[PDB]
C-alpha cells in the first residue's frame, strides 16, 4: 500500500470552471478550445511498483502518461505542445509541472471528500475541474 492509492481508480468529470480561459492562457487555438471544452473525460489512474499511469479518455483525444515521481519526462499534451514534465507528491497532492518555450503551467490533483479535484494554473489564471468515481 501507498498513500498514492487514494488516487487510483476510474474517475469521471463532473464540473469545470474557467477552463476556456486557462486554455487561452496556455495558447490553445479557438477550434481546439471549443472541442476540448466539450470533452467529458474519464481519468484512469493506476500504480504498478514505482510507475504511475494516468490515462484520459474522451471523444476528442485519448492520452496516457507513465512516470516515476520526481523524474522528468517528455510529454505531448492533448493540445500538441511538446513539454518537459515533472510530477511529484507534495503533502498528499500530485503536482505536475510542464515547461515549454520558456513558459510553465502547473496542474495539481488532490482528493477532497469523494472528489478528485484538478487545479490548473497558467500565470494568473486557475481552472478547477472536479472528478468523481465512475
Ligand atoms: O481535467 C484534466 O485532466 C486537465 C486537462 C484536460 O482534461 N484537457 C483536455 C482533455 C481533453 Br479530452 C481534450 C483536450 C484537453 C485539452 N487541454 C488543453 C490545454 C489546457 C491543457 N487543450 O486540450 C488539461 C489540464 C488538466
Ligand atoms: Br481526454
Curated annotation (Swiss-Prot):
InterPro entries per the UniProt record, alphabetical: Calycin (IPR012674), Fatty_acid-bd (IPR000463), ILBP (IPR031259), Lipocln_cytosolic_FA-bd_dom (IPR000566)
Keywords linked to the UniProt accession: Acetylation, Cytoplasm, Lipid-binding, Nucleus, Phosphoprotein, Transport
Main location: cytoplasm
Keyword Transport recorded: yes
Binding site for a fatty acid: 129-131
Segments carrying motif Nuclear localization signal: 24-34
Single GO MF descriptor: long-chain fatty acid transmembrane transporter activity
In-chain residues carrying the UniProt-annotated modification Phosphoserine: 15
Domain comment quoted from the record: Forms a beta-barrel structure that accommodates hydrophobic ligands in its interior.
PANTHER family assigned to the protein according to its UniProt record, in alphabetical order: FATTY ACID BINDING PROTEIN
Assembly mode: Monomer. Homodimer. Interacts with PPARG.
Protein name in the entry: Fatty acid-binding protein, adipocyte
Source organism: Homo sapiens (Human)
Amino acid at each position: 500500500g501507498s498513500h498514492m492509492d487514494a488516487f487510483v481508480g476510474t474517475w469521471k468529470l463532473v464540473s469545470s470552471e474557467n477552463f476556456d480561459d486557462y486554455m487561452k492562457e496556455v495558447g490553445v487555438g479557438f477550434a481546439t478550445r471549443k472541442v476540448a471544452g466539450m470533452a467529458k473525460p474519464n481519468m484512469i489512474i493506476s500504480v504498478n511498483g514505482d510507475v504511475i499511469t494516468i490515462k484520459s479518455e474522451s471523444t476528442f483525444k485519448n492520452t496516457e502518461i507513465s512516470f516515476i515521481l520526481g523524474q522528468e519526462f517528455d510529454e505531448v499534451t492533448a493540445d500538441d505542445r511538446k513539454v518537459k514534465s515533472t510530477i511529484t507528491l507534495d503533502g498528499g497532492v500530485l503536482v505536475h509541472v510542464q515547461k515549454w518555450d520558456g513558459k510553465s503551467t502547473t496542474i495539481k490533483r488532490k482528493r477532497e471528500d469523494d472528489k478528485l479535484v484538478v487545479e490548473c494554473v497558467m500565470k494568473g489564471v486557475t481552472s478547477t475541474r472536479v472528478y468523481e468515481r465512475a
